Design a protein around this nucleic acid. Structure first.
Lengths: 83, 217, 185, 83, 149, 129
RNA sequence: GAGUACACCGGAAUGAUUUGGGCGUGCCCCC
RNA sequence: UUAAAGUUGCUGCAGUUAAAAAGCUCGUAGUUGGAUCUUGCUCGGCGCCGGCCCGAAGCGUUUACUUUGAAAAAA
């Protein structure tokens, strides 16, 4: 949140879920810090950099986190295109 | 697995799948497994599509190798079908095993002796291990469950569709998941057959243990 | 020749030349039993995107059904005469104004803007009839209508979709792309 | 599911759905063409014929009314035809 | 749902998208118009004429081959009945039900059905009076069927 | 039976937004409805949307995002003035820094701030925040 | 004229000759 | 007597079990009702050679809604 002065005033900004585009509260303990390791294109070993995501707890509790992770892998191209 | 052609069925993994039986499942449909499947046939056995199983096995391997320290990966089993497989999986990778009678409050109650704060959970079966999935809600634990056609999809993050009722299927898939994570860690090459034994991760009954050790030397 | 006008304007020399081309085709071929009592109203010049061009043929409404059954050979004859200009047949309908309170007999709904545009889009693609239409409303506010056509008569129509888009952009001003579904039919 | 595409479905689930509940109005009927083996010419009969239909010439009946599709007389062949 | 019934039904015609005379059909407007003329001289309802046409003679819909529907042509001649077919069928059903009541006196359910039918015919007759189809002096009583069956 | 088509459309898209579905089917369609989501999509609350154009009342499929809280209607359509607009947005909105009121106006169906800055008003339709 | 297969002509390819039919336009009858 | 009374609820209450939906149906007012339709034809002016444009006597769907003005006693 900004103001009329021109500097930041809020204490911190919360994260965003990557499926329903909602925030994760400070007392919601079902959040995910999933990282998927992308590899080198000619060898296949781990390079060093990660690829992080976040899914809120209500999507887990309904049970659609797996297809959400599959769609994010489809968008990032980590999983195969035809599948 | 990526568009690069180094991480697919070479010639023999599909043959091992058809020999073990990781392709045919139960007899009831699930609404979260409507795409990891092809068709119900006569005798009522649903057939799981295999490339999707391979892609989520690569996805689970990537999620395991993505974290730097392997000592805080809790592998969980309670059923007698996969007691040996998770123990030798933790021996091969360096994971922390729990085999038989998972204690409630292991991740929640902190003053007890059996306490652990891990970072990743790897579950053999969602229906049998419904208690680690409940304890994975209160603390931020992502999970991977080797799911079936008759397994509810609750509090799960990566689902690998397979028949987790035969000992050969679970032993082979735990073994090749260990193979994939040691290949991605940078210790095992893809060019040569390194393999120790697919039967080395297999659970077997004491009666067949007795009769085959009496028949053999 | 065979060019008629509702008002008092003599047709220009280009449309007169294409009319004399129509008269030498009817004098050439043995179609004089039915093309003799048919007329062409007007034509225009359309500069589509790229190095191509196209023409629109205005046909009056009450004998359009006579033009439908002979359309399959006239288009081929005008491509064999001059292949550097794609031809289409468009029925000419006028648009009556809205009945505002500033300004009379009732305006029929066959002459309204939506009906005229629907009939023009229907008559624009004769060898492939419309099987479905969807409308895209883009983020800036502009609209986009996509047209689905049947799988029949695809070998000679797929190279005309840019010309169809150019004609419909020139006449109406709405961006239209064409697609070919195959699973339903 | 969470993210199911409604822009274009597979034709299989289009065929399982009810005709009013489809994405576009498509009937579940067609026109068929049958002929008597003892006769010579071809008559076009609707699929739900709903009444006793006779070929002109008064030789043989063709269809019998049922609850759904009409029962064809034996020895008569039909073709699925598209306009 | 229904008007006088508690049940709900989803069963009606579903006309296709495409508005075109089919290519396999080899009939113009004039011969099918003359066939409609002949079956009107037979003495059928527009529903019966339409189902006979689409059953035997291979037409998708008359509205897609002619410029209008059946009843406008039937009123363009002038032999179409002064009583519309819906309200005529309601009178026929009502007089059949009433004739069932003068022999079965102790039948309350059939009396209830007759009350529902009289409600239907009044509700349709006020619409036909509103749309200026019938004379305003026309009304239906319990003993007026011999003038209009 | 169905009387307020916009109320049914906004109840359906509110249920779809609550359950996290990315797309939803709206069975009838109107110019007032497509203008209402034109206002919403110009304001950035939603994304792309198609119109299933057929020979009946059309169908609308939308590409929802997570920037939407609630869609509502005001039934029946009360008329407002420029004086009473602040009375409506004081008790109909969660805050004075965001959220909009869509009302029918002779200059076009549009939000409350444009109607304030061109000095006209009319009958009310609904709200979104 | 038959319409399940047949007895035949006028256009058009090469001066003169003519290539199996059916009406459900796409698969059905005689080899 | 007013606020607290969101215990008179138009904003803004309740009707399975605390106060409560007629036994059920039909039925005239009253209420609420599906989608679609994008300005011109007798007198004379700021200019000019029988004339161009503009101005205008006359007319150019009625309603609700919305916006600007008038008229609106003082305390």
């Amino acid at each position: 949140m900004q103001n009329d002065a021109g500097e930041f005033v809020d204490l911190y900004v919360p994260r965003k879920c990557s499926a329903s585009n909602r925030i994760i509260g400070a007392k919601d303990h079902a959040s995910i810090q999933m990282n998927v390791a992308e590899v080198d294109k000619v060898t296949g070993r781990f390079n060093g950099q990660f690829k992080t995501y976040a899914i809120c707890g209500a999507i887990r509790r309904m049970g659609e986190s797996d297809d959400s992770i599959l769609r994010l892998a489809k968008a990032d191209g980590i999983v195969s295109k035809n599948f | 697995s990526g568009a690069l052609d180094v991480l697919q069925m070479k010639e023999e993994d599909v043959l091992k799948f058809l020999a073990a039986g990781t392709h045919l499942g139960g007899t009831n449909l699930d609404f979260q497994m409507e795409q990891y499947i092809y068709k119900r046939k006569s005798d009522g056995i649903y057939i799981i599509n295999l490339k999707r199983t391979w892609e989520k096995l690569l996805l689970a391997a990537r999620a395991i190798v993505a974290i730097e320290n392997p000592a805080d990966v809790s592998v969980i089993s309670s059923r007698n079908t996969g007691q040996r497989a998770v123990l030798k999986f933790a021996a091969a990778t360096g994971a922390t095993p729990i085999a038989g009678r998972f204690t409630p409050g292991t991740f929640t109650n902190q003053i007890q002796t059996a306490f652990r704060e891990p970072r990743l959970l790897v579950v053999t079966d969602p229906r049998a291990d419904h208690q680690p999935l409940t304890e994975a809600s209160y603390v931020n634990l992502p999970t991977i469950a080797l799911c079936n056609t008759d397994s509810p999809l609750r509090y799960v993050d990566i689902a690998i569709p397979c028949n987790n009722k035969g000992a050969h299927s679970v032993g082979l898939m735990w073994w090749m998941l260990a193979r994939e994570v040691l290949r991605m860690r940078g210790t095992i090459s893809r060019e040569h057959p390194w393999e120790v034994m697919p039967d080395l991760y297999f659970y077997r009954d004491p009666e067949e243990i007795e009769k085959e050790e009496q028949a053999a030397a | 020749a065979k060019i008629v006008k509702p008002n008092g304007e003599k047709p220009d020399e280009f449309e007169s030349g294409i009319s004399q081309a129509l008269l030498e085709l009817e004098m050439n071929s043995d179609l004089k039993a039915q093309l003799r009592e048919l007329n062409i109203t007007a034509a225009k010049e359309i500069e589509v995107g790229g190095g191509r061009k196209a023409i629109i043929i205005f046909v009056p409404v009450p004998q359009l059904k006579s033009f439908q059954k002979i359309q399959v050979r006239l288009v081929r004859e005008l491509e064999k005469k001059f292949s550097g200009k794609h031809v289409v047949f468009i029925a000419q309908r006028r648009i009556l104004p809205k009945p505002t309170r500033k300004s009379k007999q009732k305006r029929p709904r066959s002459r309204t803007l939506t009906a005229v545009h629907d009939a023009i889009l229907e008559d624009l693609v004769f060898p492939s009839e419309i099987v479905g239409k969807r409308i895209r409303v883009k983020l800036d506010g502009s609209r986009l209508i996509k047209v689905h056509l049947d799988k029949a008569q695809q070998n000679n129509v797929e190279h005309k979709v840019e010309t169809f888009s150019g004609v419909y952009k020139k006449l109406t001003g709405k961006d239209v792309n064409f697609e070919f579904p195959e699973f339903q039919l | 599911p969470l993210a199911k595409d409604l822009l274009h479905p597979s034709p299989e689930e289009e065929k399982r759905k009810h005709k009013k509940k489809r994405l576009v109005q498509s009937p579940n009927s067609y026109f068929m063409d049958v002929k008597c083996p003892g006769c010579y010419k071809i008559t076009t009969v609707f699929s739900h014929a709903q009444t006793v239909v006779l070929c002109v010439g008064c030789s043989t009946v063709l269809c019998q009314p049922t609850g759904g599709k009409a029962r064809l007389t034996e020895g008569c062949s039909f073709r699925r035809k598209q306009h | 749902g229904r008007m006088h019934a508690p049940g709900k039904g989803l069963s009606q015609s579903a006309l296709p998208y495409r508005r075109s005379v089919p290519t396999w059909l080899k009939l113009t407007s004039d011969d099918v118009k003359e066939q409609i003329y002949k079956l009107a001289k037979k003495g059928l309802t527009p529903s019966q004429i339409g189902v006979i046409l689409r059953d035997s003679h291979g037409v998708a819909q008359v509205r897609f081959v002619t410029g209008n529907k059946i009843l406008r042509i039937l009123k363009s001649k002038g032999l179409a009945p002064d009583l519309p077919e819906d309200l005529y069928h309601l009178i026929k059903k009502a007089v059949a039900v009433r004739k069932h009541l003068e022999r079965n006196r102790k039948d309350k359910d059939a009396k209830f059905r007759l009350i529902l039918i009289e409600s239907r015919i009044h509700r349709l007759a006020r619409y036909y009076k509103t749309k200026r189809v019938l004379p305003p002096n026309w009304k239906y009583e319990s003993s007026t069927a011999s003038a209009l069956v | 039976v169905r009387m307020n088509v916009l109320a049914d459309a906004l109840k359906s898209i509110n249920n779809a937004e609550k359950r996290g579905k990315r797309q939803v089917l709206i069975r009838p369609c109107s110019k007032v409805i497509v203008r209402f989501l034109t206002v919403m999509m110009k304001h950035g609350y939603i994304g792309e949307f198609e119109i299933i154009d057929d020979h009946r009342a059309g169908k609308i499929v939308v590409n929802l995002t997570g920037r939407l809280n609630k869609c509502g209607v005001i039934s029946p359509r009360f008329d407002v003035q420029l004086k009473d607009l602040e009375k409506w947005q004081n008790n109909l909105l969660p805050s004075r820094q965001f959220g909009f009121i869509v009302l029918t106006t002779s200059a076009g169906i549009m939000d409350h701030e444009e109607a304030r800055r061109k000095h006209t008003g009319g009958k009310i339709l609904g709200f979104f925040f």
